Design a protein around this motif. Structure first.
Motif, mmCIF file in Angstrom:
data_model
loop_
_atom_site.group_PDB
_atom_site.id
_atom_site.type_symbol
_atom_site.label_atom_id
_atom_site.label_comp_id
_atom_site.label_asym_id
_atom_site.label_seq_id
_atom_site.Cartn_x
_atom_site.Cartn_y
_atom_site.Cartn_z
ATOM 1 N N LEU A 1 3.725 -25.252 -22.762
ATOM 2 C CA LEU A 1 3.411 -26.097 -21.480
ATOM 3 C C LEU A 1 4.647 -26.317 -20.589
ATOM 4 O O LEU A 1 4.750 -26.381 -19.532
ATOM 5 N N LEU A 2 5.625 -26.866 -21.328
ATOM 6 C CA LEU A 2 6.859 -27.228 -20.614
ATOM 7 C C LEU A 2 7.341 -26.137 -19.863
ATOM 8 O O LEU A 2 7.815 -26.363 -18.940
ATOM 9 N N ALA A 3 7.475 -25.034 -20.421
ATOM 10 C CA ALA A 3 8.203 -23.872 -19.882
ATOM 11 C C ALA A 3 7.399 -23.315 -18.760
ATOM 12 O O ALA A 3 8.117 -23.100 -17.495
ATOM 13 N N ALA A 4 6.200 -23.050 -18.967
ATOM 14 C CA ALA A 4 5.223 -22.581 -17.900
ATOM 15 C C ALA A 4 5.401 -23.443 -16.358
ATOM 16 O O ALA A 4 5.584 -24.509 -16.431
ATOM 17 N N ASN B 1 4.267 -25.514 -13.943
ATOM 18 C CA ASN B 1 3.147 -26.629 -13.705
ATOM 19 C C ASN B 1 3.963 -27.886 -13.778
ATOM 20 O O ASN B 1 5.093 -27.888 -13.559
ATOM 21 N N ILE C 1 4.360 -30.473 -15.513
ATOM 22 C CA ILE C 1 4.840 -30.790 -16.691
ATOM 23 C C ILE C 1 6.275 -30.297 -16.925
ATOM 24 O O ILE C 1 6.373 -29.303 -17.602
#
Ligand SMILES: NCCC[C@H](NC(=O)CCC(=O)O)C(=O)O
Ligand SMILES: NCCC[C@H](NC(=O)CCC(=O)O)C(=O)O
Ligand SMILES: [K+]
Ligand SMILES: [K+]
Lengths: 439, 439
Positions: free
Chosen positions: B336-339, B341, B343
């Motif tokens: 999620l961090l990498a993607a 968005n 965050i």
């Protein structure tokens, strides 16, 4: 000491809202038209008839209804009438919840401990939180004010506030209480009945168990009941699931007698045996399911009768008219009447308005054993006699309507009428400014 | 306007008593030895760390524990130390119930309505009754006093009392609340999440639904929230039955983002669609069961994270250590961090003492959006800074124990230590006599 009966004077907002799941009468008569005036007069007649027959009788007044403060707590603001209007339009169901004449069933007002059973020798009264039903949970604060205004001699009476308002401590008061023994004035055996307890899976699955053992034990403590004169028993979950929402719908005690249904309690044999070895001359009149079914007990309320003691030691059963209209139940009661036991007289009263909402003779009264000295210490203005009977009937004719429906609760006039009615009533009963609207 | 985080300072009686059925962590850690002093420090480190990072931070003190007044209400009389003794010997389980450090989870202290969302332009705070669990229901009265001592300026803050204490109106406050929109100071869309509602068959069958829609609607009225900025949504009953006792264990909002598990709400697809149409820029970040099971969600508290806004618009996830210690969840978070968005940063904190009782980063805080002028109106003594941080740590070092078990709650010494510590704390935080023992 004598057992004095304190009956609830039906409030003027008496109506059928079907607010009590588990109370089949309440549910069944939802939305039917009520008659506040008739309801009040029906109750007053029973009070007077018993008082004229020589049984100490008193009265407890209705509450402030509609109760606007609770509506304000729910987010509605403005003047009283503006709040009433906002709710009637936006959340009418709340109107009914705050306009119930439910405090009339004083058997649920508190739990009593006669001075002969307490550690300090005073009469103790602990207000029931009635937490299970929202409309009734609202009663406690005012009920406490009323009890303190009536048993106002603090040297002889100790009124305790209701237990915390949480399901874990659900408490329904005297309706689940019992007292067995010799003369009323001697130390007695108190029997607290509950429907559930933490850590116990034996509990109703359809209708709720309003009373928890935890609550009963706390009440026993508050009322300073001698630990040797206390006993807790669980109600049969099966009967609760059939409409027995309080013990007084399936069993009633008086002196040495316990009149109950065969299916009233869990471990009934063990309870009767324990009571038999701890109460001298204890007599259990058990009704078999073959003569009266649980369904018949719920519709007739034969166990929500008042078991009174006459001067000869003989007893009289006070019953609602429905017991005379049900062939099987009237038949059994008369068998009981003729049978060799303390019951030597049947007395029937028409309490249709109250019964339509699940309340019979017993539900409308709170038993309080008082010594001669303690009796004199009670607010004399609430003791029943010709003067109070006539004054209350005149008061009812002046302020009660002979017809009411949920829709009428939105009438600002009803609100106005009720306030003035209670103002005058508090004067008549020498209670002072006991109601919230009066402060 | 800024969003200020108010965290609960853990009380000196922090202990594990497994008092919360439906909160699996609580149940799992029943009777384990606790560390009050350590629990307090862990929380203060998170407060101080977020404050240093530039996130407005403040504190809410613990309550009076053991709470003797409730024990007396339960029937145990005598001086403070006599009650303590009698309880320990007669019914020790009540001791835990009146000695819980539960108020530390201020996410349940109240529901907040920032001035940009209200009809009268004031900040509204309605205390939560927390009626479902007895030990937490005891919080409301003191929580109200504490909130009034912190948000004292009545021209800017309106604190409302908790809803009536009945199951029909179960309210757990902000933990079931959400606020979406552009900037904090702009009018936002408030999303109230509930577990059950009268007449609705959709409800949990294993674990209790503490929040009712009736309560939610009542709080929205009390906080005077503009009717066009309010939405009510039901929690997926199946997720409550897996341990999601509050919405903040399965979903969290911040600005235009709603980070939630795919199984968070009933009719989730439609709910998100409604939000997309009514909230400009709304962005839902759904975690599918395939990537993170509900079991792992409840064990790591991935969603009880704090979603904070960084000065550049990007967001940071403040998580409990369990999220980094669980290979699968840590893996998802890093994805999620990498993607691409909002965050862009992850921050972890050791909150093991709080987590052992089912409380994560979010549970320990209450989000209160405040304008510059309202911020200046807040009691200055509770805003976090070096001075307060060092003062609270010394305070903890002086009054907190390093170990505590249920058996220790009977120690009259513990009672004294706590009374003295709170008395000193009230002065430090400039709250005057706010606790019952001080009155
Ligand atoms: N002891 C008898 C009490 C009867 C009472 N009925 C009610 O509240 C019905 C009210 C109504 O539905 O309108 C009860 O359920 O507690
Ligand atoms: N938002 C999370 C609050 C957790 C809290 N835990 C507790 O009260 C457990 C306390 C104990 O069991 O000792 C609760 O269940 O409400
Ligand atoms: K007979
Ligand atoms: K990212």
């Amino acid at each position: 000491a004598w057992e004095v009966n304190f009956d609830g004077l039906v409030g003027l907002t008496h109506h059928y809202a079907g607010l009590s799941f588990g109370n089949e009468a309440s549910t069944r008569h939802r939305f039917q038209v009520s008659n506040p005036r008739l309801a009040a007069k029906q109750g007053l007649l029973k009070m007077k008839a018993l008082a004229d027959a020589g049984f100490p009788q008193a009265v407890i007044p209705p509450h402030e209804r509609p109760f606007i403060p609770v509506l304000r707590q729910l987010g509605f603001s403005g003047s009283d009438e503006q709040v009433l209007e906002k709710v009637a339009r936006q959340a009418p169901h709340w109107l009914s919840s705050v306009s119930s004449a439910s405090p009339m069933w004083v058997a649920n007002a508190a739990t009593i401990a006669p001075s002969a059973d307490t550690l300090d020798g005073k009469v103790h009264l602990t207000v029931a939180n009635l937490n299970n039903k929202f409309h009734r949970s609202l009663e406690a604060p005012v009920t406490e004010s009323l009890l303190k205004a009536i048993f106002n001699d603090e040297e002889k009476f100790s009124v305790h506030s209701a237990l915390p308002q949480v399901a874990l401590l659900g408490d329904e008061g005297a309706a689940n209480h019992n007292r067995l023994g010799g003369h009323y004035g001697e130390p007695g055996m108190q029997l607290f009945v509950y429907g559930r307890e933490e850590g116990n899976d034996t509990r109703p699955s359809r209708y709720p168990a309003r009373q928890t053992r935890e609550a009963s034990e706390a009440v026993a403590r508050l009322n300073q009941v001698n630990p040797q004169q206390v006993i807790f028993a669980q109600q049969n979950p099966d009967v609760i699931d059939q409409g027995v929402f309080h013990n007084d719908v399936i069993a009633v005690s008086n002196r040495q007698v316990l009149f109950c249904h065969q299916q009233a309690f869990a471990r009934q044999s063990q309870l009767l045996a324990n009571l038999r070895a701890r109460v001298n001359g204890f007599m259990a009149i058990e009704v078999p399911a073959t003569q009266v079914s649980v369904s018949d007990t719920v519709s007739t309320y034969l166990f929500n009768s008042q078991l009174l003691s006459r001067d000869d030691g003989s007893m009289m059963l006070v019953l609602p008219q429905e017991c005379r209209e049900h062939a099987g139940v009237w038949g059994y009661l008369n068998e009981l009447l003729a049978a060799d036991n303390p019951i030597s007289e049947l007395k029937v009263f028409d309490l249709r308005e109250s019964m339509a909402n699940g309340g019979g003779p017993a539900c409308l009264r709170l038993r309080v054993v008082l010594t001669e000295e303690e009796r004199r210490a009670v607010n004399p203005a609430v003791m029943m006699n010709d003067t109070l009977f006539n004054a209350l009937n005149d008061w009812v004719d002046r302020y009660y309507r002979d017809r009411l429906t949920a829709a009428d609760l939105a009438d600002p006039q009803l609100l106005r009428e009720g306030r003035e009615a209670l103002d005058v009533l508090s004067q008549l009963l020498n209670l002072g400014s006991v109601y919230p609207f009066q402060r």
